[PDB]
Design a protein around this ligand. Structure first.
Ligand SMILES: [Ca+2]
Ligand SMILES: [Ca+2]
Ligand SMILES: [Ca+2]
Ligand SMILES: [Ca+2]
Ligand SMILES: [Ca+2]
Ligand SMILES: [Ca+2]
Ligand SMILES: [Cl-]
Ligand SMILES: [Cl-]
Ligand SMILES: [Cl-]
Ligand SMILES: [Cl-]
Ligand SMILES: [Cl-]
Ligand SMILES: [Cl-]
Ligand SMILES: [Cl-]
Ligand SMILES: [Cl-]
Ligand SMILES: [Cl-]
Ligand SMILES: [Cl-]
Ligand SMILES: [Cl-]
Ligand SMILES: [Cl-]
Ligand SMILES: [Fe+3]
Ligand SMILES: [Fe+3]
Ligand SMILES: [Fe+3]
Ligand SMILES: [Fe+3]
Ligand SMILES: [Fe+3]
Ligand SMILES: [Fe+3]
Ligand SMILES: [Fe+3]
Ligand SMILES: [Fe+3]
Ligand SMILES: [Fe+3]
Ligand SMILES: [Fe+3]
Ligand SMILES: [Fe+3]
Ligand SMILES: [Fe+3]
Ligand SMILES: [Mg+2]
Ligand SMILES: [Mg+2]
Ligand SMILES: [Mg+2]
Ligand SMILES: [Mg+2]
Ligand SMILES: [Mg+2]
Ligand SMILES: [Mg+2]
Ligand SMILES: [Mg+2]
Ligand SMILES: [Mg+2]
Ligand SMILES: [Mg+2]
Ligand SMILES: [Mg+2]
Ligand SMILES: [Mg+2]
Ligand SMILES: [Mg+2]
Ligand SMILES: [Mg+2]
Ligand SMILES: [Mg+2]
Lengths: 169, 169, 169, 169, 169, 169
């Protein structure tokens, strides 16, 4: 019986909890990728490690909004990364691109729900903190995927090495 | 077929992977506790949030050793926190004490395995980075549990509030 | 009924208490030596006074570990220095050498006990804080004893005076 | 056959040696108290640890006067703390108050002896370095004992905790 | 007849002397490699020259422990580098990887001997100063070997040149 | 088939390689002496350790000239120190004096060869970097040998100790 809860639909509360789990999952995927490239693509490793920290801040801010609006946080298992054993740095970038577009669709479904329930604070929260960061991340990974393919990856040995030094350096 | 792997038993590699999952689980438990105390015990929240960051560094360093020794990281689901809905800040401290002693026993089993396989580098790694941090953490949580009980928790309203301001401030 | 005690054998607890008393005794021996050389070897006095402070920190850290592991500190009488009335600064160095090698054997017995009880944290604690400091101290006192004998002590009047100014200055 | 000894009675020399042992004993009592309060009253611990260092400086200065006046230092066993297992921080303060008043009576007996032997330098030494420090220490411990009783110790759980934070912080 | 020697087996003393010669040999191998790459891979040259200085510090610290524990240093011929005339920078990295893993096995045999003779100070010395440095060095050379092969070495003319500028720059 | 080699006789190339081995041998002799005086003449130890570093720079610069002139470096075993077990610091100085004069004769034979082959660059290199350093080193060791004998070494216990503090301090 929250004395602070106001105009916060239970469907929105449940969907925020599902988004929290998805952000944590994305953090887990990036942590997997980071530690995977320990041998020869160590700037890929630090790119994905930074991506991993960002995803956990994404989850923590949704956990904070759940408390702010008077909801109840409900956590679930953080599934281990679906994609794994990437044969190259390019394949990891492709999976991250796929991941971020899946997360973007989740955020767009969240916004549509907030719109349907007439929750302008929740729509503003999604737009201010997550919608443009998603567009930027998808654009960045799209740039990386396309550039690496043009450079000659994944066949070329120098392509991923040089991309590691110059683009992710 | 690792060219760097040397004196690294597959039982040790598997046990390191299980320890990685346990450290991540401990990080998840502390993140749950941190966000739980958003109302009235906000220094409990920052204590547990700091504990959460420490557990993830614990996991990342074990992931780094897995690569260093020529092993293969194998990740599993991060189970959601077993304990939940703590009725007070003291109960969260009791569960963290229980958690850390369970983690300590895991680390002691790890060391016994490393001793049995005559892996002095792995024994040194466990002793240098994890065994004393565990003793310190168990001692700290033990101090917090005992102090809060003496102060009159969990019945006393002022006890947890003042402990929040003075001990965890 | 310690809630923090874990893998801490009562034999180890008792042996830590005996080591505490031995470290305090060593501090008492050095304090005796320091105040003994007030007349003509005042840099011997400050060497032994510094040695005395170090031994008390040795005891305080063992007292801290006793609490950390959930043991109970049990103090005993600090026996007055066995050796006394040293006829020269060299004889005091010989007794300190004898003392430190006796303390080293105690620490090696402590480690063997910790090894027998499979207490890797206690083995690490002894190795990290006390085993190399003991080797260094025995080497230093051995150097001082040998050097003073070569210089012509204890018969030579200038030998101990110059050693006081140059080696311990 | 001291060429520096002048107007220094052998009764005074023996009584200085007994005072040295008493100061060391007081240092041992405070060290015991300091390490005793490791759990919940850690500012009591640092108060008593500081008291312990002060008592050892008290002993070292009496050892220095013994040499200054041409006497011979004679050390004895440092008895382990009589009082122990204090049920609260207040009980430790009561024992320290009892201890300091016993030490004060010793210092007053010392002064009466110095007066009887017409040793104005020894009377000045006792008055300058020890008589007012004793009055201050007895007053301080008396204040702490009375304040803690008024606050509701030892029954009140908050009393000793808050006194630890505010008075001894 | 060392007055400082304590719990130091003659087998350990002899094995330390053999390790000293091996560390000096490793320093000689790296000095050979450094001066070998004077033409076109001058950052390989400075990588191996730095490796060479490190190996001599490795030897000097073992010589210091031999004195510390009361042993006697016995030096032998420093054999000229076995491997030589490396056809590429990659082949030099492969020989250094082979060398470091041979040195690691020597250090692990040393530790097993120290364990058998119950010398915890010598086990700590090996673990603290040499076991993790060996794991790091083997991992680094393993990374370099694998990366250079992927880049296209040794056939590719640009591969070793760019690796020289970016990885070893 | 060196495109840079010009006016560089193969006899000079071979003699440079022999000089390289001799400089490394001299470095090994000084390293032996340094670690030998760990007990009572620790400024002798640092004098010889500095001498040892200088000899290795002597060897590295000859290795660099071998590459500069288009020659091929050929390394041989670094023989363990001929002289050993010096009974005093003076005897170590006498052996170093003997060593440096043997090295000087080698450098003078090298110069005569360079003169016979009309290699003015090699004559300049020997004169600029090695001939005066040799005269200075022989003069210094000659001074040390003579001074220590006059002071009363090796019989006098104070002589080597004071020389250690004042001349080599
Ligand atoms: Ca908006
Ligand atoms: Ca270790
Ligand atoms: Ca250790
Ligand atoms: Ca006065
Ligand atoms: Ca150790
Ligand atoms: Ca010239
Ligand atoms: Cl939900
Ligand atoms: Cl995570
Ligand atoms: Cl596994
Ligand atoms: Cl996490
Ligand atoms: Cl006991
Ligand atoms: Cl003491
Ligand atoms: Cl007396
Ligand atoms: Cl004390
Ligand atoms: Cl040997
Ligand atoms: Cl070398
Ligand atoms: Cl040759
Ligand atoms: Cl060398
Ligand atoms: Fe991102
Ligand atoms: Fe996100
Ligand atoms: Fe922690
Ligand atoms: Fe942990
Ligand atoms: Fe010491
Ligand atoms: Fe000690
Ligand atoms: Fe006091
Ligand atoms: Fe006092
Ligand atoms: Fe190295
Ligand atoms: Fe090495
Ligand atoms: Fe020189
Ligand atoms: Fe030279
Ligand atoms: Mg699954
Ligand atoms: Mg915006
Ligand atoms: Mg489940
Ligand atoms: Mg061990
Ligand atoms: Mg440690
Ligand atoms: Mg007795
Ligand atoms: Mg150490
Ligand atoms: Mg008694
Ligand atoms: Mg006054
Ligand atoms: Mg050979
Ligand atoms: Mg280490
Ligand atoms: Mg030979
Ligand atoms: Mg000329
Ligand atoms: Mg010149």
């Amino acid at each position: 019986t929250s004395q602070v809860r106001q105009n916060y639909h239970q469907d929105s509360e449940a969907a925020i909890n599902r988004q929290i789990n998805l952000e944590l999952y994305a953090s887990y995927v990036y942590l997997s990728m980071s530690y995977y490239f320990d041998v020869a693509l160590k700037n890929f490793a630090k790119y994905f490690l930074h991506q991993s920290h960002e995803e956990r801040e994404h989850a923590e801010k949704l956990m904070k909004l759940q408390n702010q609006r008077g909801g109840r946080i409900f956590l679930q298992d953080i599934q281990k990364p679906d994609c794994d054993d990437w044969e190259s740095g390019l394949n990891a970038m492709e999976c991250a691109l796929h991941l971020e577009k899946n997360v973007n669709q989740s955020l767009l479904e969240l916004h549509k729900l907030a719109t349907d329930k007439n929750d302008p604070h929740l729509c503003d929260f999604i737009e201010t903190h997550y919608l443009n960061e998603q567009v930027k991340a998808i654009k960045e990974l799209g740039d990386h995927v396309t550039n690496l393919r043009k450079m000659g990856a994944p066949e070329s040995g120098l392509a991923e090495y040089l991309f590691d030094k110059h683009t992710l350096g």
